[model samples]
Target: EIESLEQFHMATASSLIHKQMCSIVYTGPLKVQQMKNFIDSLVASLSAAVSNLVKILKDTAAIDLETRQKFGVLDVASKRWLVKPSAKNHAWGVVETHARKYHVALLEHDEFGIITCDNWRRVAVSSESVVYSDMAKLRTLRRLLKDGEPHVSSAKVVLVDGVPGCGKTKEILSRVNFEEDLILVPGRQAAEMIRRRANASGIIVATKDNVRTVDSFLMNYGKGARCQFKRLFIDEGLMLHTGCVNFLVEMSLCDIAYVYGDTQQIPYINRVTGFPYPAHFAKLEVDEVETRRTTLRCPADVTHFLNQRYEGHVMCTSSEKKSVSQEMVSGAASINPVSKPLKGKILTFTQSDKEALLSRGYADVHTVHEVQGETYADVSLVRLTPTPVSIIARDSPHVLVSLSRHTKSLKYYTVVMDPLVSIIRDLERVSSYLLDMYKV
Candidate 1:
């Protein structure tokens, strides 16, 4: 509860800061006199220590374990914390249960309550390991492209398809030999990770939603413009809507367009049949696709759990069977406890199901629609129902993308239910789900 209060207080502080800044810069009788006086009197006469509160709240979100250890919040044990009286109502059990499972030390704040692992920033900024090399596949693709050979001409659109977590991104990144090129991703989250990877490489990376992508391409790489780049790379090609793909192609010179994606992960609304994949161009297929083999970010057992309903065709490789890590589980700390007392984000599910998971004092809660190009270390497949077909069940791509997010382990509390069962069985049913999800 203290954490929620702190968050609320932080928002209040931010509003006050905005108001104070606006009053100083803008000129009006209300702003110059009335607003300023009202704010001034409130700050001076408020009994809840608003000024000191803001000072503490500003730094609270940024304080990680290392920072806490450097300042205070030291552990008396390896993974336990003593609750201060102010934090007694803070719902420490939820965080404590997570810490015990992940085997990490817990930190408690007297005023802010239970502090969940503040590691997403670190995980976001940290470099990812390239799981496996795709040299043979790259060689095959280059041979088809006719690189450095006769008939090497203008740009060509190529579809590089693979199952989820089969190192499609890593494969494309490895083959990219030029510095002056663009990589487009589906969402801000995926773009943020790619931007971090290209921080020192001089590669131009932008999310599809960002206007800067079109602006930069026309400005920096357009003909009679700066013209520095020679190629365009689109990752998560399946997730992109048709218009987004068309816009990107029109903006580019098409000078060797390289596309990396999985057809099963397409989330675009009102897309044509084989929308992005059936382009008229030279093509090369990964051997994994031929064999129906895949490398999952999740564990083999989790794959097995999913396969019970889907199919055994989506098999995990020997290399992908490793255990989940603490760092990976930390990605889910945001939805650790779905209780009102601690008050996390009201995760877009039912109140009954929400409290059911919370009463257990465990579970990492996530919806299917939004998690694109993300991986989790541990996953609990709690239930699958057609609440008008949740995002995962909405389309083939969503189901594949959501299931592929787990790295180490997965458990199921409920079995896969209908429309999903029928959809998985029929490709046409899959497209039907696509239309369903696209309806607002």
Candidate 2:
């Protein structure tokens, strides 16, 4: 039944729906044909009301333009993050036509999550050729537009990363004078390796702990510097073990960071070192993932095999440089892993094996964990049983690290799991020694 209406067209609503029921109620009398006009008019009214309902809901949720501007509030950039943690004195909140309780004012931003900010210049480059070219381009363009600084940004954080042994140190060193740049390393051995290879002069090559040396040499890179430090280079960024807090401090200190890393090698996190690995560039939300396929160590065949999992046209410089040869020594017959230690071979194994090789007078010895940041002329891998499952599952990462450690040849001298030996003999029977080594 239709309810009585007031002069203001009073309305009330209720719902009853075990089974849904749609009823039409009107107060006035109507003929059948006349209902067509009334029905049409009501539908238009309902549609307009529905459309505006959505518009009004959006209006309620959104910081509308007219209201925001009237309140002197602006976009998300100007308004929302005003109270963020990372944000400084800008603690003013938004106040507008919607809610007036704070009506007094808008809520402050946590700023960190607390708050995050903007105005950063980022670059991601691959190909040594392109990087050198882009360096000139960025510098020239930057110098040309040096005058503007009110709202724009460019505290450049350049992430320099590539595959192992591509001579990134040599390449990066070629770009900046060592005397002018600030070079940091996990250990002094890498610093020594750089100096020995490039025969480099006094660049501020300091470990993270001894950074007081960096304090005195504070002539930053850019002319009108905005940051505390400038142009910082991190060698072997992936393999580093800098404590987390220390790394955060290092990143904050510099405006421009050339952080070089390699993912193929055992990363810092996997190794036993207590320090945080791979640096905190992930925390910085670094600009690129450039896995440079070029290696100076292995030949084309070895490179191809290594890249079966990596997506690239396998490449190496070893083919051209005969000084380094890549050898695949398989079925060496005996488990005589210590028959002869090649002059520069680095043996990668567990503790007892390390002691065993060292006691037998090997030139270099390291557990797989100890060898990421260091390179050698020859690398020999050892596992007591060398299960195929172990190779694929447990030592998958180990194999990658072991094979990548050498610049010339990588030798595998594991007595492969017994099952593989039995199958091999069944196919082609042979009298072999302790039956070790399977290299690809």
Candidate 3:
């Protein structure tokens, strides 16, 4: 091995001066392959380690950002109104469970509208943005684009797709190689979620909101503008307007266009075919996280079903699956949208179901139609299997959206996949028990 190493060094013996160069050759055995592999693994994981450290740093910044960012009146953990809300003093503070302790807010409840406490384990409510990380086309696409051998008009646009939160947006948003690129995502909420990602690494020479729509972007490069931006990156473009897609193509702007979105999301946008998916609402509890990495914000049962749903995308990351579901089960650390005691967001099937949840003082809950790209500290999947044609049952994207949103906990009663899948096959058998979920 030493002799081979000497020969290898001799083969590549070279000097690095501006004008002089030396010819190096490879004459040693291929043992360097193993050595190269070791070095490559070392550097790659170091890069990944940096990613994780930055994730921690981002969490630290969240402390300052959170005080301003999380403007909700209150936050809750377990059954206690520890840091009380009742800003206007609507009169809170009755721990029905007699569960834990309740602290005093005094006059700050009127001044700032919330009281803050301190914690159990400092809230590791981190997410999977860095956890899940996608792939080569024929390699020809990458090589060709790199060598400047393409034209957007000559099918210069390429489409990249994945299931929502399956890392499609995260993939392209972080993957823009060449710059002055304009990135377009689904909407404002999606953009807000993007804001939380401190890990975005790219040369975004063009980003006011960092997400440009066809209408918004066109006005800039549109009226007789040829190609001010070299690349156009459309993240989640399947949900984007086709007008933008058409304009980019027909207008002959952009050196190359990269498109991305979920495959299932495309169906509802068809408008002609309506929603297209099996009764996914039926199997919500068993649904898996269908992501590249197993690091989960929700529980294992929640992610298990999604992983199976998106079958084709062959992921090649650390396959050893150990879900980071600690926060998901521990309700105390969950993030919240609103809080009068904050039992957490409930995913109800019908208006009546949502109404009842609200009627009982469970303030922040909704049907599947109402939620998409919205995350809370906890999520409850009520009526795990909907009555086949219910509102949420009709749409697949919303089903996927609601399932992926829960960062803290997922609550659903004892429902098995066999019976839930059977609900799809036997749609007309609507049980008497199922009819009670919705309002009359």
Candidate 4:
């Protein structure tokens, strides 16, 4: 190991100059010690690289110009935001958790009422030039649009969707009426969206996945928090599982509520064969009910309603046994995407049940972590059981991330699963009870 240490050290050090390169440390043989040492070493090395880079950029304009020119359209602030390590981390962290702390700041920019971020990395412009719009006008227009459209006020939902670069952020920010609505925080981009959310008098934007962006912002990686918004607004919300974890943390620690936007989509790249098995939610246990109350931020009666309404409605069935990207998980900390394949009998029943719930007008189905203060309108479950054992296996908490979105006077629900398999005994006692109550 010593003979080649010189070459290895230079390579490692140089990598840090251009990236947020990290190395695992080994102190004794214990994993904990090794992890701590590794992180400490990486942090130290990265910090040194950042300090040096910042100094050089400030003292040397030529270097700054060359780097940004190579990238095109990037400002000094944008480049620095990625290379200044601690400063970048601080800024990125602020953006990630900005919804809780600076919702007003972000909203102002989104509505075209405000322009220019303090950090000055990105900009939000009005869809139209010269004719800037305010949040109020945007809301009014949307209401009119809703009237012309079906499922408007009746849904009590503020749907936000759009193609990439379509400025869904601007639209949602300009129109969200927080005073009268419930905020459902999704994945990352807190600094950018919090201000728009603030306009909603009673609004709350519960965000998660800010940490993921922190690396890019601090480490100078081409990829970082920028993708946070893209995945959410476009790619079916694959990053939501990890984001949900952070959302719950904020909800429990800070009063926030959110709809699970990506419960149905495959979570972002993660590698763990059978990790995050569907039935994982079944294993979730919290002391007393305050856990949900603080984190979910919904009314109590609503919680009770969910606890009582659906039977295994939280479950989802798929034909794939091992989730596709276990590699992503082991490398970057992310949500477990493992699922069971719902082939033949299990698959058929799963779709039938999903259709039933959709027919009931249920949207915003989510995992347990997200629906803190809410429950299903009719209390339903979705299951995908393929093999007899797989059916029972999918019943684990992993299967149900977001199953029921309706919380208003929920009526009933259906569970489509292969009759060949009995319900998994491992289903949470509470979930099982709710299911038994509504059996057809």
For all predicted structures, in order, the TM-scores are 0.41, 0.45, 0.42, 0.26
Question: For residues 189-214, could you state the per-residue lDDT of candidate 2 as single tens digits?
Answer: 56656555554454545333223222
Clash count, predicted structure 3: 9
lDDT of 1 at 32: 26
The better candidate by TM-score, 1 or 2, is 2
Question: Candidate 4: where is the Cα deviation over 4 Å?
Answer: 1-186, 189-191, 199-217, 220-290, 294-385, 388-395, 408-440
Global lDDT of each model?
A: 0.38, 0.39, 0.38, 0.27
Instruction: Give candidate 2's root-mean-square deviation (CA, Å).
Output: 24.2
Q: Supply the global lDDT for candidate 2.
A: 0.39
| Ranking according to TM-score, highest score first | 2, 3, 1, 4
Give the CA lDDT, 0 to 100, for residue 99 in model 4: 26
Q: Which candidate has the highest lDDT of all?
A: 2
How does residue 130 of candidate 1 score in lDDT?
12
